[PDB]
Design a protein around this ligand. Sequence first.
Ligand SMILES: CCCCCCCCCCCCCCCCCC(=O)OC[C@H](COP(=O)(O)OCCN)OC(=O)CCCCCCCCCCCCCCCCC
Ligand SMILES: CCCCCCCCCCCCO[C@H]1O[C@H](CO)[C@@H](O[C@H]2O[C@@H](CO)[C@H](O)[C@H](O)[C@@H]2O)[C@H](O)[C@H]1O
Lengths: 93, 179
Amino acid sequence: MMYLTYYFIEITIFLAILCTIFIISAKNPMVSILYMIALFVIAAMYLYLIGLGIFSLLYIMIYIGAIAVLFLFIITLLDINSTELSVKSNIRD
Amino acid sequence: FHPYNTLGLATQSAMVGLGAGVVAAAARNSLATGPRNILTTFSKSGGVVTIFTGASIAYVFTYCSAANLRERKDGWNHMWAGAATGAVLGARTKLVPAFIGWTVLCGAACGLFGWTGARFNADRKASLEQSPKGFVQEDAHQTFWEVVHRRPLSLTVEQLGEGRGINAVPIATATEAPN
Ligand SMILES: CCCCCCCCCCCCCCCCCC(=O)OC[C@H](COP(=O)(O)OCCN)OC(=O)CCCCCCCCCCCCCCCCC
Ligand SMILES: CCCCCCCCCCCCO[C@H]1O[C@H](CO)[C@@H](O[C@H]2O[C@@H](CO)[C@H](O)[C@H](O)[C@@H]2O)[C@H](O)[C@H]1O
């Protein structure tokens, strides 16, 4: 039982890696903002793990509650074109 | 002095210069204009790889070699190394005079760089701020930055040499009458 909650921090590390790669690879930016919200949640989780739930909640009510509301509030109103992730354009890096 | 290891330093220097060529190749492939890919790095690069490797090889090989042939550590070595490096870089332009010019002027610049100490930094203890200065007190040996009201004559004759007016004893007293 004890060690079922031993590797939660490593899980959050792996999940943050995933959400970063997904922010970078997503086609429509709206999805990239949703993955940013997933990342702020994972950060709030990790902060609860190390004993700072107050900042977890301040993050959820600041970043997610305002900044990301606003990011969607912008991309909903602007004509932000894109260029889907490719191999001819980005492999060189 | 303590001798240099020519081949040990040259092999390190070549791997370093190859690595710098790889970094500059990738950075050019990213910063360039037209359609490219992971293939162009070593095909369409303007000799960044051979530039860096030949320079680092020639510089370090010549510095350690001439430091060991002259058997000293000084600025003339860095001059010879900059002379080799100028030859390598100027061989790219397939002309004799530009090859000679690249050699001489890269050599003079590296030779100056060795004159001033072969560093862009400062020693910080050989400097004037952190070193004795001003008037030496009582007959003590005159260091570099120290000033002296009256110098010894033996030290003058040694540093300069005899002749051309400069002598071990003055002229009148040398030709004074023993009376
Ligand atoms: C990977 C394995 C690693 C192996 C271990 C060892 C590795 C050692 C690596 C050494 C560092 C290598 C870095 C190479 C420099 C970066 C490559 C480059 O291209 O720099 C220029 C860059 C792009 O320029 P580019 O696209 O080529 O177009 C050229 C047209 N002008 O455009 C730029 O603006 C970037 C410039 C970067 C400059 C960095 C700072 C250099 C400082 C200058 C030194 C000056 C001091 C000498 C002054 C003497 C005075 C006479
Ligand atoms: C074109 C003119 C202007 C160009 C700019 C350069 C001007 C400034 C002068 C550079 C002075 C360099 O001087 C530097 O080396 C001298 C030796 O020569 C050193 O002087 C020291 O050398 C050691 C031997 O190594 C001896 O003990 C010597 O008595 C002294 O203490 C100092 O550590 C430093 O002062």
